[PDB]
Design a protein around this ligand. Structure first.
Ligand SMILES: NCCc1c[nH]cn1
Lengths: 225, 339, 231, 283, 58
């Protein structure tokens, strides 16, 4: 009543912009946001191949679910700054190569390529920003792991490991070491899996993991838990 | 041998600089401004409430008309706001959903945002087709762009997560001048009122003065003990203030090259994300991570007001050129104005 | 930005005809559409208007109930349906685009036009009809209104248009004090209260035609008689 | 009688307690901005209905039992009848809607996430349910008095409308308690089966096992408290038509009328228990 | 490592360049800040003084 003719149309334009922003937010709310993380030589291409600038994004659809992965492996800076920008994602897809047990980093040091992934895994798990976000661990290069342990013992990376030098026995000890880094067992749960090369299981494991986390989260906002 | 020689020479130079800084100190700001009357308890109230964003807000910048302001959020849109009628002027869909900085041209025709994609996109608000279009994208950086401020329509200074700052030419899209004096991630930059100098803050707990023409570093400050996330020039341009995660704010002058005053409180444990000055420089507003905002008297280093309108970490803070309005952003998708 | 209009011609009284406009080169959805017609002798009168979003439709008092205006956003085409045409429906209709926001310039583009021949409102009146100023001398075009066009916001919703001989109208100064895009600094004017003036300086040969005025404080938009400068 | 005054005081204490609990839920919602989910709104609507039914019906029915007769002239009580019945059916349909939403939570996993936090659908559903229960219960008993016209005593009558009837009560009981009970039981059983199958598939292909037990006991209590209270009242009104006053025990029907209130008295704690927002707002 | 030598020499040159600047006393800068604040505090800012009938706040 107290507005002019040009103001009453600006109000309508603002209302249309508000109507568009609301539908854009409702459309972006039906999408799954997954943070893709990994140390050096962690064989990331495994899942990226099956699913098909500083931050790279990949968008695929599987079983009427719009997944969006955001690779941050090309960002070489302080993680503390950009780590909070991903608060609220569904789950994290971390990758650890199994052939790193007897390899050293680019800088010749006592630090092993397998322990380097353990340091990054413990950090992202204990971050204050990531408290209830689950982790989907993909152990890459399962084939080369079996061949190398036959020629060289596992005592290089894990000297206290006393057991039979086989594929299943050695891989099980490595899996326990990464799963024991999770201090908060109650709030968050790790999902370990082996990267199938020829098979398409990887995309299926993420589907089972994402739907499981959503069910575990939908009940948290309904009063059952 | 040679490494130790160069290190001891650098240490001797640093000791000489420190002696020159300490010897040229007669008194502190508290002794000079002792007889100054206090501002008094300042009480502000929310005059306008903007609720157009659907995600966390990281940046907010005012225009030269004191009525239009731009805000960046994680939803992927840039919104022009009307502070007097709570209306939206333009909606700019962003290509990258992660943005941490926004700028407004002094003429009022261009808006630039940064982000984690290492690309600064120039948007033209005044078009002959009635739609915001991308003018030029600046991808000559290898780190996340954390701040950007327009020197003029064709020249914009953009600081990124890499140790190298840059000066750009929008018409050519080239890096004219590179500043390679920092050893850490640069979080924020503050242009001088004369648009000839600017002070940048980095995560190495140090600030450095730069020149737009020569591209060299003139002065270095090391008062803070943590990563400096916010910076702001005094209205005269004689000084500037910073803010780190050490729950302390300090005022660094450009003529004395020493810390004048410090702003810290015992009940403050959170960091500083935004810092801005009033039109006259008598009041200082800083953004805290304790879900609230505080006002500090620059001359007396005393708390004048406490704003608690937001319910999340207060990411950004801006003051109009006139001083007739003060807006504050936060991770809570609600914008408010105080006066 | 090009607005092409077609669909007009000779129609007997009592029939019906439809006009269409082809919009291209801009966002048709974000721009509101206006309808202005010009009598064969002189005079402009607003006929219809629709806002962005197929809402806020307004009509003129003379053609109330007989005209229907619709816009198609996907095809960027404007429609206008006429029924029960009378002897007054003899005017060339010019399609106008407008957008409303802070700093916007409504009525910034005018189409070429389409001919049509059939066999409490603010009133703008000006006695001056012709000006004998020779090329190279300053000119002054004054207009008056029935009431103050100033609003509580502080803006005076006054518009100035120039229709050169054999050309479409063009916006020179909007809001009383602001200049449109593509207009030289020669055209300028400032007026308060109910009296306004347009002070053209360094008159050129191209700056000829009929200068109109319009108020946008309230609807219906009403134009004025206008002054036709001679060269 | 002998201890009746003491009993009246105990009943009064219960009225105070229920209103206070509902008030606390209202206060938590007002103080905390984060209570903006479709579910929280449903729980609040349930708390609103609980406070309404309590503060309206109980203080009006108290003098009815105090003096053994209605303390006003006729027509005053019909309002009590309609509001009591309206708010009771509203609470029933509200718990039904909450059970349906919880069933859709585990079943519709991905699509429920976006639709929550949207308040328009929640408001529309809460309103539709309320107006439906109102139009179902109120006008019928309101117009049956004008239709029949049977008024036994100005003070002793108006206990209910058309109380001594088999058809109407046997029809209303199925809609008010039997379908709600069946729906809640089916939803809880389906949720338990789905979550146990999920846990078994995750274990085959701990702390989660403790959660399973938590959800199992919680879903079993919410269906039992609603069942153990509403069933006797719905069963007693049906047998009332069979034996017209012959069956009537000493004060069992009177306690049963209060037993349905005991469900509403213990309701806001159990069923409108916010998932984790009330735990934060309680501090 | 010649790279470290070059980096240290560049650092030494930068320190020498930054050491030639002329510094003023803290008292002079404080007095200038006080003057600039008190000068433009009467009518320019709308924060410390709160006038009425001209503020667009409502
Ligand atoms: N229709 C439920 C009857 C009732 C209400 N209050 C007590 N009993």
């Amino acid at each position: 009543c107290t507005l002019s003719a040009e103001d009453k149309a600006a109000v309508e334009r603002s209302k249309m912009i508000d109507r568009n922003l609301r539908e854009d937010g409702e459309k972006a709310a039906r999408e799954v946001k997954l943070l893709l993380l990994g140390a050096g030589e962690s064989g990331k291409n495994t899942i990226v191949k099956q699913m098909k600038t500083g931050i790279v994004e990949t968008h695929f659809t599987f079983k009427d679910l719009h997944f969006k992965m955001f690779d941050v492996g090309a960002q070489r800076s302080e993680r503390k700054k950009w780590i909070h920008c991903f608060e609220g994602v569904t789950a994290i897809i971390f990758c650890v190569a199994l052939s790193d047990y007897d390899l050293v980093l680019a800088e010749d040091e006592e630090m092993n390529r397998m322990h380097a992934s353990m340091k990054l895994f413990d950090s992202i798990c204990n971050n204050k920003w990531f408290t209830d976000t689950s982790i989907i661990l993909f152990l890459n290069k399962k084939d080369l792991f079996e061949e190398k342990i036959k020629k060289s013992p596992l005592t290089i990376c894990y000297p206290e490991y006393a057991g039979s030098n086989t594929y299943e026995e050695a891989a099980a000890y490595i899996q326990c070491q990464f799963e024991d880094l999770n201090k908060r067992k109650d709030t968050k749960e790790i999902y370990t899996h082996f990267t199938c090369s020829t098979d398409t299981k990887n995309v299926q494991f993420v589907f089972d993991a994402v739907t499981d986390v959503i069910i575990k989260n939908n009940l948290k906002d309904c009063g059952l838990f | 041998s040679e490494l130790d020689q160069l290190r001891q020479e650098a240490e001797q130079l640093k000791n000489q600089i420190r002696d020159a800084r300490k010897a040229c100190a007669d008194a502190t700001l508290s002794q000079i401004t002792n007889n100054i009357d206090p501002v008094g308890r300042i009480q502000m109230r929310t005059r306008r409430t903007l609720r157009g964003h659907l995600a966390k807000i990281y940046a907010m910048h005012w225009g030269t008309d004191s009525r239009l302001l731009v805000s960046a959020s994680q939803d992927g849109k840039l919104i022009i706001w009307d502070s007097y009628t709570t209306n939206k002027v333009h909606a700019i869909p962003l290509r990258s959903s992660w943005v941490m900085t926004c700028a407004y041209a002094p003429s009022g025709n261009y808006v630039a945002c940064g982000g984690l994609d290492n690309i600064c996109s120039i948007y033209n608000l005044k078009t002959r087709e009635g739609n915001v279009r991308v003018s030029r994208e600046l991808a000559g950086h290898t780190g996340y762009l954390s701040c950007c401020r327009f020197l003029d329509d064709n020249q914009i200074v953009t600081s990124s997560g890499d140790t190298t700052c840059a000066l750009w030419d929008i018409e050519t899209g080239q890096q004219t001048t590179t500043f390679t004096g920092h050893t850490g991630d640069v979080m924020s930059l503050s242009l001088a009122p004369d648009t000839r100098l600017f002070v940048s803050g980095a995560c190495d707990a140090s600030a450095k003065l730069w020149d737009v023409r020569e591209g060299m570093c003139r002065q270095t400050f090391t008062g803070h003990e943590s990563d400096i996330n916010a910076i702001c020039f005094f209205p005269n341009g004689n000084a500037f203030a910073t803010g780190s995660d050490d729950a302390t704010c300090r005022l660094f002058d450009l003529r004395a090259d020493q810390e004048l005053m410090t702003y810290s409180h015992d009940n403050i444990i959170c960091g500083i994300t935004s810092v801005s000055f009033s039109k006259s420089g008598r009041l200082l507003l800083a953004g805290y991570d304790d879900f609230n905002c505080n006002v500090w008297d620059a001359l007396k280093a005393d708390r004048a007001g406490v704003l608690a309108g937001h319910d999340n970490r207060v990411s950004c803070l801006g003051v109009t050129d006139d001083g007739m309005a003060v807006a504050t952003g936060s991770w809570d998708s609600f914008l408010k104005i105080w006066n | 930005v090009q607005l092409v209009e077609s669909g007009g011609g000779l129609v007997q009284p009592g029939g019906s005809r439809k006009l269409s406009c082809s919009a291209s080169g801009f966002a048709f959805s974000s721009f509101g559409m206006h309808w202005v017609r010009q009598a064969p002798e002189k005079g402009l009168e607003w006929v219809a208007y629709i806002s962005s979003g197929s809402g806020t439709i307004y009509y003129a008092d003379t053609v109330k109930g007989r005209f229907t205006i619709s816009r198609d956003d996907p095809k960027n085409t404007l429609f206008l349906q006429m029924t029960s045409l009378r002897s007054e429906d003899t005017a060339m209709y010019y399609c106008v685009r407008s957008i409303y926001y802070y700093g916007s310039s409504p009525f910034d583009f005018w189409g070429q036009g389409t001919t049509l021949t059939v066999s409490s409102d603010i009133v703008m009146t000006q006695a001056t009809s012709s000006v004998p100023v020779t090329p190279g001398e300053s000119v002054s075009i004054s207009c008056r209104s029935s009431k103050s066009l100033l609003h509580s916001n502080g803006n005076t919703y006054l518009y100035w248009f120039l229709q050169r001989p054999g050309q479409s109208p063009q916006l020179l100064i909007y809001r009383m004090s602001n200049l449109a895009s593509g207009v030289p600094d020669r055209f300028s004017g400032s007026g308060s209260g109910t009296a306004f003036t347009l002070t053209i300086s360094r008159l050129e040969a191209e700056d000829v035609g009929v200068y109109y005025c319009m108020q946008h404080l309230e609807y219906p938009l009403t134009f004025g008689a206008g002054t036709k400068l001679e060269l | 009688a002998a201890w009746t005054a003491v009993l009246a005081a105990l009943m009064a204490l219960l009225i105070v307690a229920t209103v206070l609990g509902n008030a606390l839920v209202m206060l938590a919602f007002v103080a905390d901005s984060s209570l903006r989910t479709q579910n929280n709104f449903f729980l609040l609507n349930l708390a609103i209905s609980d406070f309404l039914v309590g503060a309206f019906c109980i203080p009006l029915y108290v003098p009815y039992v105090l003096t053994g007769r209605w303390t006003f002239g006729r027509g005053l009580c019909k309002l009590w009848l309609v509001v009591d019945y309206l708010l009771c059916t509203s609470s029933a349909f509200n718990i039904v809607l909450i059970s349906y939403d919880r069933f859709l939570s585990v079943t519709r996993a991905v699509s429920y996430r976006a639709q929550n936090g949207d308040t328009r659908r929640a408001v529309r559903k809460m309103l539709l349910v309320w107006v439906l229960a109102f139009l179902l219960y109120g006008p019928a008993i309101l117009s049956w008095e004008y239709l029949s016209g049977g008024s036994s005593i100005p003070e002793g009558h108006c206990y209910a409308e058309f109380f001594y009837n088999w058809y109407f009560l046997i029809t209303a009981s199925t809609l008010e308690f039997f379908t709600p009970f069946l729906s809640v039981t089916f939803f809880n059983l389906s949720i338990y089966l789905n979550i146990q199958r999920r846990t078994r598939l995750r274990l085959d292909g701990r702390f989660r096992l403790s959660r399973d037990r938590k959800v199992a006991k919680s879903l079993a209590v919410i269906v039992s408290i609603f069942g153990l209270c509403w069933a006797p009242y719905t069963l007693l009104m049906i047998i009332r038509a069979a034996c017209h006053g012959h069956c009537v025990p000493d004060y069992w029907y009177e306690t049963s009328f209060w037993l349905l209130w005991a469900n509403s008295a213990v309701n806001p704690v159990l069923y409108p228990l916010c998932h984790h927002s009330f735990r934060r707002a309680f501090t | 490592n010649t790279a470290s030598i070059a980096q240290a020499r560049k650092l030494v040159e930068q320190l020498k360049m930054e050491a030639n600047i002329d510094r003023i006393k803290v008292s002079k800068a404080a007095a200038d800040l006080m003057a600039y604040c008190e000068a433009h505090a009467k009518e320019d800012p709308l924060l410390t003084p709160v006038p009425a009938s001209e503020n667009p706040f409502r």
